[PDB]
């Protein structure tokens, strides 16, 4: 067998990829999302009740479908990154990255020694298909994609420095965490926040990195796509489930 | 503690109850549905991948919310009905009931001896809260609601007989199974099917029983409500999740 | 490896075995019960939310301890009996046995062809330790113990006939189901019920079968032991958990 | 989306398919087996500790790989067949089929009304991808494959009659159950059993049906392939795991 | 919907709350404990085999009952605190707090930016009911209660400093960890330990914070209540299960 | 009950122990491995998808068999070590230990205060059998075995210092991580690597500590045993499953 090609990583340079947030934390729900035709699915280990084993079930579900899986760990924890790479997550979104030093550590966390600090256990890993991918340890690093979140004042204070880190493929802006950090909690739509987001996207693309964002607002998501943003998540499964059920009930009952 | 009042059963005589089908087969998804404010939630053990233990998790989720739980077993199996009553399901929807004899057996399956054949294990049952409901074995039968599905030609051939069975609280029409039985598989909207559904609802209500149905078609659901149908399910969680995600993607990609 | 000796089965002829009902339906709770030193533990598949897989977890827990596991299936279902034997349950308690014909079918359900109808899959079975017990298909039947419940009027109406069935090792009286069948639901302590229970125990032992019963009443359990009853369950884990927590809270408030 | 083509069903007429028995009862173990390149994988619900939900997890695992999934239910139970078809199992192996009447009922159990008795719930089914396969209810029946086991004297007594049932695609011989039924329990290699197996394979192929069998004996499996047997399972995952670990330990320790 | 009122937090200033430790690590066991009527239930993520997902199941169980849930994480880990708040834990008990600097970090970990560092993901959180609590990001912080454990010499060495931290609602004394730290492991009943516990409770209440403790000794628990201790846990579910089963068996054998 | 004797720890001084890596991450697969007769089984929490709860299930499986369980946590995390000790793991293998200071911290993490920093919760712990081991807090430390991995250049740079740490019972060499650290990723068989491994084993034994290693290469494993290496793992369950299934298929298909 040949290593699974990371099409998400390749497409960061060739097209704009439309994403769905997956927080229903279940292999059955993830499979429903995988049937829709999103370019990417974010399996959220930070803000949904997921662990390594529930994330594996969702990778196994999504694997039969063209949608590319991206996993967000709860934090930039090097041992947890090791675990998520070994179950076969090829794209990671690291929350709350705030320095070049932390971004460089996240690069090393995704690469085998001697250049990186990714722990070696290919005989045990779904990532290598338990060594049925016979050249895994030489081909693995090429198909790993590292995305970091800038979503704090300290992150913005270190943006130029993070954008200079080789091996950071993309910077994702987190509008909920960023608007809260800026004193606009629950109000990312404010001009003060939006002006910072737009300038940040422009800086990311000017440094030759992919820019990413989530907005469940159709008009903001389309504006971000017009700016050239490479990976845009346009909704959240928990939100779509709750809203569709509320909208339906409102046709019959107040 | 006093036995949990079955408000669904009481409301069969006083109002029209709006329902949501729950086929996502998970405690977390059931809790999302419970937050919307449906009169009833149908936990589907027939057409969703549920078992006694996954149904218990969903009863526990939904129990904190005013929505009334109804459980559909995979078939009119007396031992499975015993299990679903003991985990605390107070309303059951039995699929594919086709005779007065089968409906009578379903009544006995829901009632303690000596009148019925419900197995007795109150010390072990969530239904009795492990005997913290101190009079459970005396008060249980009063709060149990039995619904049967008529959804085959043999069911329609025994309708008057089923409507004469004391202890059947409601007859639910299954349009998917019934349209297939009638040779209109996937097309319940045909006049031949709809004329049979309407006369069936009229006969059910004329015999003083509650009539029920599911339609994800808003216009058909409202027409059934205009006929006086007592329990109308208006949608399905799996369908609402798939459709909302597809509708969203279509704003950005073909 | 040699087949696991069924000590419960041997002790039916040599001592009186004290039992605990296990309805907490979890491997961790079953292990706590296994540490106490009961002669037997009844893993309840009838009145607790258990399935084959949760029953397997509890057999694996209990296997490291001297307590002997007995499994109660939800009914005398031949395919379910096959499944419970293959995960390695050596003693089964079949509920609601009501005829010699049903008791004979339960005997065949526990024995390999050509004498019985137990399905053969030793390569897959924990029962054979996946054929690490090399003579399993020759030695299995010897260590299987079949107990049947008499707990209905029809059961009592066929008692002499059931007691004549070779391969029935023991008859267990179910006081909750029997008192309900007799029109004393929730009141097994009535003299009318107790006189029937005592005569039934006497008839079972006079036919050379083991008699069994459950009573959470210390005085009745001790009377049943005085009669020579071979397997007496003296409590239920769910009841002991609820009662101990209530008794503790009562020291500090209402 | 178009319905998933059943390549296993097509290949019954074009080639000999090599199979692996999957009894490790887990989505992670099933994925390991799916990586090897077997033509088919038998997910065993009869002799491994599987239920509908654990079988779904294994279908989701195997779905990303070319290996074709076949599911064996615990028995020819029509409601359980409904459940396994709705989670998306396209090929079923029914154990212990003993008459044309039972085989015809198994055909109806796999087909929608009005010709069959398969329950209709396409909005909820992984089988229809929750109606993302838009013509599922008209295209489903064509991709369903029904296999029945002949593995008892009564089965052999009704072989000509079962081979005349339209909609039975294949007859699988179960050597463990059959050798036990013939009084050769644990000894299927006896000439008396082997002569019956060979004649049975010849009769199955002479009636224009696919013949199938399992043998972990390489020489018998190759003899069955030389006879033209269309679907041959050549091993069992639990057996291969136990034997490989024993063989390795024997190199170091007695 | 309005945010769930934290009654435990309110009652720290108005009454003495009686608590039960929940370490059976299961939604079904947590529901049994929720039926008893304790003021609070401690779901133990430190000393019971719990994770975020098992803690969510127990919050869902307990949510239908008046008992208030308190969650103990394994350590004062900021990302784990984020996860437990988002699944809807409103009261946290942080083990082994040893400085005002650590206590201040725990305060920030429970509060949204810009004042705190709690990660923002309200669309995904059971805590916001997936934004069905429409003002959650404005009202959340008010209903969060932070308790810290002092249970080491360094903790006692920083007690006055921790008691000066705004946002610490309560200090819980851990007698097992503290008696071990003091060189009286397994013997918290020693006068040297008890005199330190009593002075600590007095200092906590003198600084206007709630004091808490666990003792399964009725006499010590009642003495702590006489001192005015605001939150007293009086037992542990695992201990009550083991002890009740042992006490019962002792009536019938050694 | 008396504390469970750690025979693995005792045998470090008396024999050479043969081990199997267990990475199938399931109680059922662990039980299969437990039946073979390995001296020790390594439950891998670092490179297999395990968590505290899945590791508990595997300890419960393995506990009925003479094989000794060793648990590898994902990292030298003090709170995770606390959790794994409380579920009853008596031998721990800590990955990537790189200094005497870290090794000393790992010793304290495994010992109760006042000498160590192991959190005290014996009423809740399977390790104490919920205090059914009445002297657990006095006898626990004696039966705990700490193994550390040296598998990086920094580890080798601090080897003499680590070998001087009292309470380190054994040093395990990780050839996959070490060969990668040395610039021979996927090629531990190189003379440069093997000469370092051999001198490392010699230094470990010269300092009176047990030496350990894993090699799935029979010739290297036997050479390590000839050097006197005290604990040698000779294979990996995932590898043996994949290889045995591939070897079997190759007899029938290319
Ligand atoms: Ca199950
Ligand atoms: Ca978990
Ligand atoms: Zn964020
Ligand atoms: Zn229907
Ligand atoms: Zn009974
Ligand atoms: Zn068979
Ligand atoms: Zn403590
Ligand atoms: Zn390593």
Author numbering:
A (entry chain A), B (entry chain C), C (entry chain B), D (entry chain A), E (entry chain B), F (entry chain C): 1 to 254
Question: How is this structure described in the published paper?
Answer:
Notably, the use of Zn2+ by AbHpaI as a native cofactor is distinct from other enzymes in this class. Zn2+ binds to AbHpaI in an octahedral coordination with six chelating atoms consisting of the pyruvate core, Glu151, Asp177, and two water molecules (WA and WS1), so does the geometry of Co2+, Mn2+, and Mg2+, which differs from Zn2+ tetrahedral coordination commonly found in aldolase and nonaldolase enzymes. Notably, Glu151 and Asp177 in the Zn2+, Co2+, or Mn2+ complexes were more rigid than those of apo-AbHpaI, as reflected by temperature factors (B-factors) of the crystal structure. AbHpaI has three and sevenfold greater affinity for Zn2+ binding over Co2+ and Mn2+, respectively, while the Kd of Mg2+ and Ca2+ to AbHpaI could not be determined. The Tm values of AbHpaI were enhanced by 5.7, 3.4, and 1.7 °C upon binding to Zn2+, Co2+, and Mn2+, respectively. Consequently, the result suggested that Zn2+ enhances the thermostability of AbHpaI, the highest among all types of AbHpaI•M2+ enzymes. Zn2+ binding can enhance stereoselectivity in aldol reactions and enzyme thermostability.
